[PDB]
């Protein structure tokens, strides 16, 4: 074999090298660290796991550091008790966190809450199963009318559409984790909560004070904030994470299918990568088969051209867990089989849209591509290739991010002196990697007299 | 607005005038009638409530008969109490009507259960879940060993996979429904449990011998030997219901999206009616809101091009119809809005793609169909056009029937004698529809000097 | 099948019925009378002797009346003796019609030469032979300095490439031989050295003065005036003839196959038809065969999109008439055999014309049948270069006989079209009759419906 | 710049360097040398001075031998006289080459002339003049009745329309001729009257066995025999030459244009070159300017996409060879100007070569440099009538001549290319020093990398 790449959210269930072994030969691409939960010894065990695991089997895979990010909820209740709000009440949120709550008033964990939030601003809560309207605001209490019954529970997340939180892109503990990413290695960044392109640069600028200035943000939008700025989001990061569950929470249930897809595209065109997370087979935590419609909505979602596809609880907390990567596994495959490429004035642009046009009109399997820092490959997987890209680069890190993108197979070589001599290594290594045999044509794509970050050259070959 | 169909099934919430005439209203087209559930008095009373609407509004709607069709479930357990079946375990299923079952052999209702069956097949329950795998058969008993875990309960589904059941087309009861519909002159029969191009057959012959000759039939796709016959299913219809969670327990998650593709494709190539239907927005049943993932399973579908969208449940048995109807009919026109045509030799083929070719380029807003038995304006209606389709006919029946295909105004007139009269009368007629201005293009679609079933002429008007 | 219609120029080598009747065999088309030579009677007497052959034979054909047009030619010499000029020698003409010729100077017979010419401008005499640059402008003498050396001759021909020529738009004799094509009721008038805009209006209304405001007018361009307002004299004629063989003496040769190929596209682009004139087979007046280049020429212009060919001279006083239509007739047949049509790769009249003949391709129809009035619908099927025919019925006798020059179209004269099923009635019954078409054959019947003349706005597609 | 080739016959009028140098200037790209006439001295006389000139001022161009070829002629007659010969007479060729002949018979040079030709052939003498049909064969006499009336001369030629001429691939002359092209190093070879794959084989074999294996054999398509046999003549040779008014004389005209546009497509696919020959603007032997008809047949012959245009007499030996040489330019050069690149609207270089120009002209590349040893990737991206100029690096002084040829291409001579990254680097630096393009211009570089020769493979881009 498939292209589009797995996602794995590892946990306790599969912590182990023994599970991690079996997950990747499932179809698991990335391990993906849930900073929500876990102490640093117990995610520091599961890298050195995986990176054993890949020196005793010399397999590759990627390692995604999730953060926690900010966030509004609210606090507790008299004796932990759910209470019920009633549509049409009057119900208050305090800025006083000291403040224990019921059915009349509740506190909130951000001070600033009465201050971003004006008067016929809706709030949600928990996941939107509440909902209110703001009728006035005095000092630190905010007064709302609610909108439909429903329990109110403790420590519940809260959500305001089309309202610009002033929370800072980091948390305190996001700060800390970050710095934990950077001496540990890892190879991405999914950062949590990205409403503007300032948040994306605040945490850019923090891995750069600590040695992590070659790791990928992935810019999570998970809300509506983001979906408006998502343009200028994109520009600063180096992929997307498409949160179709937390964004169905702030839009309209209608539009959630086409912000994915307008995101997809965007995307795509941009030669960035963009994960499917959430809602995935969250049925498979408890059962040992997905449904039809979570089923579909995977291939759906690897339709709309995604570069990979993720795992949550279904892997980490989960009871079937290798059922559901090889399940994905299974429905990537099927799914990638059947797709075309698209293909559709930078230099680049038009170098790499050839050599995809030129593979297909000579039926080669493969496309070889000389890469240092990546774009290269990326540019290549824009058009959709049905060859597979086998990517030579001399960077470790740039090799292990590679796993992500669809349809690329990363190898780490020493060197490449010339482009001549790019070609002869690159027939060799076509040969022996069994995705080509001899006689086949091949595409190998590459930059030539040009510093990295520009491809310019497209050469064709028999094995 | 909107161009795609909602079919709703009605029940005791929604039987009444006051609410059909508000569904209506909120954007059903199509009444669905499921013969499963309700005597002819109650059906009858709906339709007529329905018939009565319509004559007070002056609105237009059809009238889809389902059936219950034929079926395989167990019977009886002692007590009437669940069963827990063990995997591994041996056991039995017996022609034997006659006896109580329990944890080692139940009973079926079909007598050729053993028959139909080999040793190796595979035995489904409970919509599956529990599969068994046949190994032995002794006269009336057949011998089983379970497969996974599960509670078996009284008067279950069963399904057998890739294996021909040798039921009739029809069981007595819907023989004698669909008599009932022949006389109260209902506009579709959407026939369950369809297999074999045969069965088909079958219900038109029966149809035709009480005078429902021209009663269109929707061969209900519910399993996998009528996936296999597909082709020949088709080509015997009048329109098919892909049923996709019936359908989810017969073949791999894997392949269903790729089924309802595949067979949406074949049918919009027939200028045959395709429907939507099961597991679109069950949540709807108990909540006044759909889930993200039902929203997108909707608009996914209708992008694969349905003709229309069913509702069961939802609207029959459910506690919010009238919001069911609404998200529906928002979700139609939000992916409508969006879709593009397909421009892809019979005469009727190109003329009609040339008639859509040509509304496009001249951004006509209508296209206006002479029909006598709807072909034309199914005919235009194949190239997704923009323009919406308003469909002239002399035939009542014909102008109920268009009204289940996508994006079709149908409108009943008392004569057209010649091709400029067609002319005349339909811009006369787009005027008053409210569908086009004075001054706008309109393309006008017809047959001249050829019998109908032919489609030949396009013209071009200005009003 | 052939398509490309020819035109035939007739005289006294080819004016008998006998020989008429022969021509059209061999695949003319259209008579065209040259009047830059012969008289009311004998011109009179063709038209004549084409009607008779039409009506005795049930051919159909057209009557072109091409103009004399306006001139600038030099006058006479001393002894009518051929003089000697000498590149680089100072020369000189005058508009006093008085004055014999001789070496130093000569006479020009238009009163305005010293007037639209401007110092340094061009001036060249006898089809080119001699160029000269005019050095100064002294009241009724233009003075100049010859270019070449060469033998000028006793009244001969004069062009001013890039001149703003100031002759009227019909010379006197081009009035009284329009009036005269009123008369005879032809279907074409060619008019001479269209320049402007204003020329044509100028001809339509003098045709419309005397009964010939059905006459379609044929603007010739000829010169470089004229094919800078090629855009606007388009617009205002009902098609262009164009004149290669003089456009060569007034601008660069480089340019001439250009201007040919722009103004072919323009006038297909408008629905109106375009000729091939001059310079065809000219090697056919003293010979029985043409030259290679001749037949290529041809070839080529067909392939540029032509409506029509025309022969003159070959045909008209050439000893080979016959032998000249015959292969004629073989390169228009042989060419147009191997073009293929145009399909635009909004109006309404655009979009439905054009959406027929792909139609007729997709199902390999044989015959596109029109109902046109005035003829724009026939055209504006001639467009896109069907492969089908079209057979193009009407009830207008002059529209029946123009479409004779437009490129693949088969007319034919009917009594009535009441409706339009009555349409697509009559044509399947017309065309099974004309051969052009058998039972189960495909058809595409273009017609307008329930609108005026002028717009075509409905295909329909027939089995017969 | 412009971009078509120009070929210039050098004869007397020409020949010194001052006027080869002149030529160059006004366009001319390579030398002919007509082998039907002049002594080895004097052609051997016209390369040297070629050669002094290119040595002297830097410019580089190529030299074609064109052989006489052989021949079918008739012989002497009584007295020496014309003789008139009357259509329906009886009339009578002789092998016997020492029968003098008078208006019953005549005698011929080829003495299979009674094999070759079978009763009902047509025969033609003088370019067609003459024609007569065969009525039957004895001995050494082929007997005949004439179909036209003409005076027959003294050593006419002779042609055998749709007619298998078992003549040699080479006469003697043609191989005494050829050595010496040998000697002298040509870059081309025109070979006459090509009919066979055999013939072809027999030229290459006959440069093999002397040293031009490297030569480049054009072959002269000039009667039906070769026509239809071109697609293997084609196959055989490096290159064709139409000579389409000698087909004028064997085929039938009407299909004389379709035959060069089958030829110049044929010759385009397979990446070899096509020149167009005969009857281009002869009207210049005499006059110093053309005609129309000559300038549009030539524009169109380049529309057609020919290689290169040659003149021949025209450059020899007329009264204005430099006229015609600079109109020729003139024409090129408007031309080409509006020509567009055909890009195949699978093998490697296809797929390579032609994805080059597409990406060439998405960019706006005004230049494509290419690295060629045998020339093969040159023309392959030639093929595509790129708007970017070729600029062709090789180590092969013989492959940077026959360059000159092709047409777009500006061959440069290189010490050396030792690897891909050299060429991009020496490419750029030569595409500056070349003033073809200037610093911040795109380019696109073609090469064939880890291969051999005749396979191009590699496309790069770069910025200057």
Redesign the interface.
Known sequence: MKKTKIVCTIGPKTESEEMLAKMLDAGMNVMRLNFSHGDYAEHGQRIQNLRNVMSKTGKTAAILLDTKGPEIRTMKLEGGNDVSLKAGQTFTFTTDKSVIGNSEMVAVTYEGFTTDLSVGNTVLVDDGLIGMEVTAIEGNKVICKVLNNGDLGENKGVNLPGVSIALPALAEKDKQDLIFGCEQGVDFVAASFIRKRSDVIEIREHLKAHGGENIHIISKIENQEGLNNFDEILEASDGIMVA??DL?VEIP??????AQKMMFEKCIRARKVVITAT?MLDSMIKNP?????????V??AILDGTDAVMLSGESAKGKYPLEAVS?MA??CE??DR?MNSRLE?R?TE??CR?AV??AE??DAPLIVVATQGGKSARAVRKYFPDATILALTTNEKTAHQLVLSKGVVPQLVKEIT???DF??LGKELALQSGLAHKGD?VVMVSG???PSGTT???????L
């Not at 088969?289 to 909505?297: I, K, L, M, S, V």
């Not at 310019?456 to 028999?462: C, D, E, K, L, Y």
């Open positions: 179709r569950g169905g249930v209608e539009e959630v299918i086409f809602q088969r997905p449904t039809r419609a979570e089923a579909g909505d291939a759906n399940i299974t429905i099927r799914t059947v004035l230099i038009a170098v050839g046009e030129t009109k000579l010339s482009t001549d070609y002869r044509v030539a007299l040009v310019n050259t497209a050469s064709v070959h028999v």
